[PDB]
Amino acid sequence: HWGYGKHNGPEHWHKDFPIAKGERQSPVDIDTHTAKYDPSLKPLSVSYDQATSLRILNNGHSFQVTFDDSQDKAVLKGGPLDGTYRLLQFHFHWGSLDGQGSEHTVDKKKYAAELHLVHWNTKYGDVGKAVQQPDGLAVLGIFLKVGSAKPGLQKVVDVLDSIKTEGKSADFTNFDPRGLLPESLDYWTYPGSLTTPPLAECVTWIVLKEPISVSSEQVLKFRKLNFNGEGEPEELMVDNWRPAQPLKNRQIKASFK
Ligand SMILES: Cc1cc(NC(=O)Nc2cc(S(N)(=O)=O)cc([N+](=O)[O-])c2O)ccc1F
Ligand SMILES: [Zn+2]
């Protein structure tokens, strides 16, 4: 089906998923001079000390680490959110060159990659119900810039050889997602959508201001993954990002002056 290619990429998605042309699509460009400081926003509360990672898998568009979401073990709350959201998975978007790869942009600046931690609202009981609701999901977005290595990322980097091709997975227990956070939790927030099909408009986006640094050797290993399955022609998994969409009738809010 869909992908990031010339013949099946984001400009084609509306044919199968007409909400692609909807009123609250993501990602967007964050224009820092038009964002509104909102003093009523609360600090984010990230409680990941009890997180239980399970598996790591190549799904043909990205790779994801999945977590046990059967209890409140790793939760996100506060900020613009009402209620408790459980961590389900995280994944990345990255580019073929260091000057591209993020989905959100800041004053039109692209970062080398973007990390998405996907959480769902526990009032809805299961994630399938949550994606049907306007406040069903909260995705925490973190920008990656190339510089010094991020020690907390290396354990992800070292297992990617074992999930090179579409459909491969591997046990990936005891991974602590706190190692992927920047120092500051200052953020922008806006109502948006999933950035992959089905592009459901169910996401409160929380995009952190401070990027994390990763080394050139770390991001190079992202670029060695494959879109294709084993035994097919090799296409490198790169540029798996959706370009910015129209903001339309939305306000981006900032948690900081
Ligand atoms: C109908 C339905 C869809 C989903 N899909 C989903 O949650 N996440 C997902 C999100 C993004 S993103 N960029 O929107 O956060 C990127 C990737 N990916 O690229 O692998 C993902 O696999 C989950 C439950 C559900 F019932
Ligand atoms: Zn994503």
Side-chain angles (χ1 to χ4, degrees):
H1 293 87
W2 62 271
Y4 294 91
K6 306 146 296 301
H7 304 290
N8 65 351
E11 300 307 322
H12 294 277
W13 293 353
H14 68 91
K15 287 180 286 183
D16 281 332
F17 304 94
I19 204 174
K21 292 181 179 296
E23 300 298 314
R24 53 174 286 180
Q25 289 288 301
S26 295
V28 296
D29 178 60
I30 299 164
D31 187 81
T32 60
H33 296 95
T34 302
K36 183 72 188 298
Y37 171 72
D38 183 354
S40 63
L41 290 173
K42 297 173 63 179
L44 289 173
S45 177
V46 180
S47 297
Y48 293 167
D49 49 341
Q50 294 299 323
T52 298
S53 62
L54 297 173
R55 307 219 75 188
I56 187 170
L57 69 87
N58 180 335
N59 59 30
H61 26 6
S62 179
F63 68 91
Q64 60 177 55
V65 174
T66 57
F67 292 75
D68 179 5
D69 62 348
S70 64
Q71 292 178 295
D72 290 346
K73 290 179 176 179
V75 299
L76 177 64
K77 45 176 289 177
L81 301 174
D82 287 340
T84 302
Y85 289 59
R86 291 179 184 168
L87 176 64
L88 174 67
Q89 52 129 299
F90 65 84
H91 59 275
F92 300 75
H93 301 275
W94 61 92
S96 56
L97 299 169
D98 295 348
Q100 65 190 56
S102 64
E103 298 199 304
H104 293 86
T105 56
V106 178
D107 289 338
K108 301 295 180 66
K109 177 184 168 64
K110 295 180 174 75
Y111 286 86
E114 178 169 346
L115 168 59
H116 291 163
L117 295 146
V118 179
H119 304 78
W120 58 274
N121 189 339
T122 59
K123 70 197 295 181
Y124 295 127
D126 75 42
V127 64
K129 303 293 182 313
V131 299
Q132 294 173 57
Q133 302 301 325
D135 59 354
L137 299 185
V139 180
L140 183 63
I142 298 168
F143 297 118
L144 278 65
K145 64 178 181 180
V146 174
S148 303
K150 187 68 170 174
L153 180 66
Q154 190 58 45
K155 292 148 296 301
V156 175
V157 170
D158 282 342
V159 70
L160 293 178
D161 282 342
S162 68
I163 59 165
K164 184 188 217 247
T165 55
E166 181 185 6
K168 288 187 177 298
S169 66
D171 288 338
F172 192 74
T173 57
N174 296 118
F175 178 78
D176 183 353
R178 291 177 298 182
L180 300 174
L181 300 178
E183 297 184 349
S184 178
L185 296 177
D186 286 345
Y187 62 89
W188 298 278
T189 184
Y190 75 103
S193 69
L194 300 175
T195 66
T196 58
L199 300 169
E201 290 176 341
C202 60
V203 181
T204 296
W205 280 94
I206 299 169
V207 177
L208 298 183
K209 170 180 72 182
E210 180 184 329
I212 61 166
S213 290
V214 297
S215 66
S216 60
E217 293 86 0
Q218 295 184 306
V219 63
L220 287 174
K221 291 179 181 177
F222 291 184
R223 294 172 185 157
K224 296 314 187 181
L225 295 170
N226 270 94
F227 290 121
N228 54 300
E230 183 178 1
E232 297 176 353
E234 184 177 3
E235 295 307 325
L236 296 173
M237 182 182 283
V238 295
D239 288 329
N240 57 350
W241 51 274
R242 189 189 191 185
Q245 304 294 311
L247 185 64
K248 291 182 175 179
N249 187 19
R250 291 175 289 176
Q251 177 73 68
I252 296 174
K253 288 177 167 69
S255 73
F256 59 101
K257 63 176 176 65

